């Protein structure tokens, strides 16, 4: 699994709507203060990964006080999780990626759904939000910092 | 080095009640990491992908035109945090020096307009404090480590 994350004031999710017809986008999910993650699922990852992000990235002490002192469960501040396989994106090859190690998305969409559960469960049920999986999103986020921490948990 | 692309339909760039200083429409933002043993071709390697990676469709041609194709922006901010260890508080070891560093990005910003164009590079305030305004256009999200 390989995640980005994204220290934020906020963060503000659209999607485009299904039978659009003569707006086109659609606001599903909004955060304040706290995480934006950007994950991507491996096609041979095991719930172990999955267990490791959500723990990272519920526990880094990624704010100040002391500096890098408090995580964003100590102060209460929401986490926007989307699901992005282009992190898998191999650009080595050509200049054009090539998403292979990318888990095939009826498979990834389960997983990632058990991840969000986890998530709220080791968290709190009003904190973790999500995008709508595989379609296409319109994300405005408000870097703080910037804060960005990259993690692969296949080192 | 280090990147994280992403695909963008604009941002802002400010600093401190805050001062904007750099702005683009749509293009890339990059969040650029430099390691302490980089080398030049480490540098060029980024500028040759965030140029030429073909990250926009072209309806239905997804993956077709990168930013340059579109006359597009790249917005280029450091940030050593991609060097943080996390093996349950940071450790930025790995990170180059500051004053060193910033010589680097510098270095690299001016290769960026060599590359492309002077008006097409947008940058922040080195080592300091910014907030900046992200519309992501996807998203799409893209990570490069030169140390591979």
Known sequence: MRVVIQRVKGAILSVR??????????????????????????????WEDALYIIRKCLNLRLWNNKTWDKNVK????????????????????????????????????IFYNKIIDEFKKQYNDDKIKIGKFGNYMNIDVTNDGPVTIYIDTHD
């Open 17 to 46: 709507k299904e039978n659009i017809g003569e707006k086109e986008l659609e606001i599903i999910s909004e955060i304040k203060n706290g995480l934006i993650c950007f994950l991507g699922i491996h096609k041979n990852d095991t």
């Open 74 to 109: 100590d102060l209460n501040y929401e986490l926007l999780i989307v699901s992005q396989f282009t992190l898998f994106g191999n650009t080595k090859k050509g200049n054009k990626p090539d998403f292979h190690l990318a888990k095939e998305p009826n498979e990834a969409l």
